[PDB]
């Protein structure tokens, strides 16, 4: 009835997808073989929740997703691991060669030869659906596939499907930490092509979750298995009202409206406040007021950006579990009282609320605890212009000497595409200033 297609692009989308479908199975009672044993004593219901899992008459449940990397190393871990009997065998690897961290290869050489094959399985999945609400693209700024192949896809998907929510959950490059020397080019050429096609892009940064895992969860040597489970919760909260009941339900078309003032500033951030271990799970009450304030603490942001250097435009608060609206209304009045959380003049009602009853589920082997409450904040702020400005400066240092361009030019790109992108990102940087000026009369 309500059905969402998730797309996982690259070595980062997948290892987040593996972190997601691990969780989507637990909440709904599915085993890794795709079977739902408990249904035999219900004889019905909708635990075979059609938002993510499609059911066969034999009792098996297939997830609605595409997994694409242009390399076999990451997906072949699925075909051989514990979640091999769950997915359709059509997981797409023409990855005889990778993109070499090159927007040109993911967009002009090797993004071809698989893109028509990728639209086919999506065209197949959608015809199995009735209420196609939107898409969920998991990718990473910094790669060739997650930057190039995503752009090429968001273009082609904006034609075959048109006016539907295309939500991105993207790993934004950290300011200092990085694992490549070509993230700026791949991140600036991506925004230039995705801005006219996407509808809302939720950013994350690994440099921040590393810090969150240190202070709160007391993990001093974490890895990506811990990071991606936190992301599995952000998406579960977003797509919860499409699965379970609640007091205030939130469709996908509500983030597109509340959090996008103008079509070019659709770059919000994500948080998850009650990230605490089983040790700190006691000793604390974990109220809505305890949780809601923790979503506004800059040290608990999943993107390395201080909103106190900027202003808020639209905030969306998604509540889970034993939550009562009186507890929420008292909280926002506390946040609107604090003067360090500044809102623009042209948005006095800068809050969106959603309440669902199903609490979060604890994955065995994880470091997160069991809680009766969980909250996810989605915020659009003017502070993220600082990060764009860093990225445009890095670009300028290494484009003025035409460094690394012959790798891009050698795979189908023109030198003029670099200058077009930088100016577009400069306009956006300027657009983030106009919205920060208080009007006069």
């Amino acid at each position: 009835m309500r059905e969402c297609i998730s797309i996982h692009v690259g070595q980062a989308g997948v290892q987040i997808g593996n972190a997601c479908w691990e969780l989507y199975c637990l909440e709904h009672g599915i085993q890794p073989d795709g079977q739902m044993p408990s249904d035999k004593t219900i004889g019905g219901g909708d635990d075979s929740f059609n938002t993510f899992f499609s059911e066969t008459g034999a009792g098996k449940h297939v997830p609605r997703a595409v997994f694409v990397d242009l390399e076999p190393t990451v997906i072949d871990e699925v075909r051989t691991g514990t979640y091999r009997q769950l997915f359709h065998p059509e997981q797409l690897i023409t990855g005889k060669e990778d993109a070499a961290n090159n927007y040109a290869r993911g967009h002009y050489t090797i993004g071809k030869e698989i893109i028509d094959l990728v639209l086919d399985r999506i065209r197949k999945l959608a015809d199995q659906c009735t209420g196609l609400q939107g898409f969920l693209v998991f990718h990473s700024f910094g790669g060739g596939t997650g930057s190039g192949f995503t752009s090429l896809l968001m273009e082609r998907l904006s034609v075959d499907y048109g006016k539907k929510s295309k939500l991105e959950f993207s790993i934004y490059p950290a300011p200092q930490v990085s694992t490549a020397v070509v993230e700026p080019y791949n991140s600036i050429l991506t925004t230039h092509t995705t801005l006219e096609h996407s509808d809302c892009a939720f950013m994350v940064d690994n440099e921040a979750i590393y810090d969150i895992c240190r202070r709160n969860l007391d993990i001093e040597r974490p890895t990506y298995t811990n990071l991606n489970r936190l992301i599995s919760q952000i998406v579960s909260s977003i797509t919860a009202s499409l699965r379970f009941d609640g007091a205030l339900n939130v469709d996908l078309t509500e983030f597109q409206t509340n959090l996008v003032p103008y079509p070019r500033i659709h770059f919000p951030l994500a948080t998850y406040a009650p990230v605490i271990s089983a040790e700190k799970a006691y000793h604390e009450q974990l109220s809505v007021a305890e949780i809601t304030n923790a979503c506004f603490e800059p040290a608990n942001q999943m993107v390395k950006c201080d909103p106190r250097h900027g202003k808020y435009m639209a905030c969306c608060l998604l509540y889970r579990g034993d939550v009562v609206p009186k507890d929420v209304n008292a909280a926002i009045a506390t946040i609107k009282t604090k003067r360090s959380i500044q809102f623009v003049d042209w948005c006095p009602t800068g809050f969106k609320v959603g309440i669902n009853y199903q609490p979060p589920t604890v994955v065995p082997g994880g470091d997160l605890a069991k809680v009766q409450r969980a909250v996810c904040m989605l915020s659009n702020t003017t502070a993220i212009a600082e990060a764009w400005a860093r990225l445009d400066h890095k670009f300028d240092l290494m484009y003025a000497k035409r460094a690394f361009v012959h790798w891009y030019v050698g795979e189908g790109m023109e030198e003029g595409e670099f200058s077009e992108a930088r100016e577009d990102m400069a306009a956006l940087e300027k657009d983030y200033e106009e919205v920060g000026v208080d009007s006069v009369e």
Partner: protein, 434 residues
């Protein structure tokens, strides 16, 4: 699928590569018959990168052994892992190049080169998708310098969209092992600059210091030295054979290591190397490995990076590492040692992590670095070269095989321009205001 063809030219490469298959087979569970006697199921998943399946799950490597002397090929056959190579892939002749680059390029090598292309075209066409090539040679002689550089000139024409990696033993600064090292090392650089994408520069005097200063070895043979080179050769090609959290092919490194098409000369390294006693007194962890990798006394290139600036470096990790422990540590280098890095590349470091470590170590690491301190090696040859060519000392053995003095002057000015391309970057730069 990312298949690689290995080519071994000279008494050096055929002595290195012969250990390279003693090191890879132990990692994939292959015995000296080609039979599989391993433990894990990840070995056979991507064994096709280096090996081919023959009849009964016997595995034959994609090696190519070339030389102008049959003595080296007899050592392989009459050795530990001699019975696995394809006996139709041993190409050889007699009456070797005589330390003459003129013979291995024009006169003798040109007679034997088409035989080498017969093997290459058969192994490449038999491969599903070619990632690139791999050559182990020694420039300083005539076979590896001459007959190797000639093959690269030809494969680059037939396979111009594929990687051509090269592991080259360079002339050493203090003591020579061939009187005409400069003429042969020079002319090779004139060709490698135009026809390569990654050239790993090795020097034996550094390995003599590694084996003495770190490993505390008092009698290091060439087996031990080549037991170090084979390691780095395995680290570069690890993320194609085993999985991990952040994988890196050959092209992803070069795209992240070659900022301009001519600066593809690297200073490799390996960690953690230790003596057999101090092993029980160390703690294996990333901050202990990163200190060895970035140590100037763990390089194989005989060049001090502290006399220059790292344009860009890489680090390939193998084990159940923590990524926060990795990303935190690489940042500590740039912020601490910011003078040894360039300003117009904000992050001068790439990282990669595999999940399946080496046979007996819970964690290993491989290091690749592009620095302006490689200027010192080329600037030396240019001094020795012109000192000899200005008097025309040994030139009549090169002209008598069909060469001219102009071809000696071209290679001089090219190598001198590569010096200037590295020297502009080494001096600290500054914009007007920035």
């Amino acid at each position: 699928m990312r298949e690689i063809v290995h080519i071994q030219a000279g008494q050096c490469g055929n002595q290195i590569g012969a250990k390279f298959w003693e090191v890879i087979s132990d990692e994939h569970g292959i015995d000296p018959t080609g039979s599989y006697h391993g433990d894990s199921d990840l070995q056979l998943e991507r064994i096709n990168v280096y090996y081919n399946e023959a009849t009964g799950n016997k595995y034959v490597p994609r090696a190519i052994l070339v030389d102008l002397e049959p003595g080296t090929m007899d050592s392989v056959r009459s050795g530990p892992f001699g019975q696995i190579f394809r006996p139709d892939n041993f190409v050889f002749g007699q009456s070797g190049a005589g330390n003459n680059w003129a013979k291995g390029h024009y006169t003798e090598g040109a007679e034997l080169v088409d035989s080498v292309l017969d093997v290459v075209r058969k192994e490449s066409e038999s491969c599903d998708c070619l990632q690139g090539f791999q050559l182990t040679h020694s420039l300083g002689g005539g076979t590896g310098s001459g007959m190797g550089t000639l093959l690269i000139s030809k494969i680059r024409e037939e396979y111009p969209d594929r990687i051509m990696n090269t592991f080259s033993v360079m002339p050493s600064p203090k003591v020579s092992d061939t009187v005409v090292e400069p003429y042969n090392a020079t002319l090779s650089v004139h060709q490698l600059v135009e026809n390569t994408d990654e050239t790993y520069c090795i020097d034996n005097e550094a390995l003599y210091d590694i084996c003495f200063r770190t490993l505390k070895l008092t009698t290091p043979t060439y087996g031990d030295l080549n037991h170090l080179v084979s390691a780095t050769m395995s680290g570069v090609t690890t993320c194609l054979r085993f999985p991990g959290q952040l994988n890196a092919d050959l092209r992803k490194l070069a795209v992240n290591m070659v900022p301009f098409p001519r600066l593809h000369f690297f200073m490799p390294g390996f960690a953690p190397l230790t003596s057999r006693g101090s092993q029980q007194y160390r703690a294996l962890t990333v901050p202990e490995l990163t200190q060895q990798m970035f140590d100037s006394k763990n390089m194989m290139a005989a060049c001090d990076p502290r006399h220059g600036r790292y344009l860009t470096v890489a680090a390939i990790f193998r084990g159940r590492m923590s990524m926060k422990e990795v990303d935190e540590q690489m940042l500590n280098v740039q912020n601490k040692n910011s003078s040894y890095f360039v300003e117009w590349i904000p992050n001068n470091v790439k990282t990669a992590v595999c999940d399946i470590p080496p046979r007996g170590l819970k964690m290993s690491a491989t290091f690749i670095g592009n620095s302006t301190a490689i200027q010192e090696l080329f600037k030396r040859i240019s001094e020795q070269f012109t000192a000899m060519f200005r008097r025309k000392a040994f030139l009549h053995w090169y002209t008598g095989e069909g060469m001219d003095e102009m071809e000696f002057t071209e290679a001089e000015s090219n190598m001198n321009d590569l010096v200037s391309e590295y020297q502009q970057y080494q001096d600290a730069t500054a914009d007007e205001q920035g």
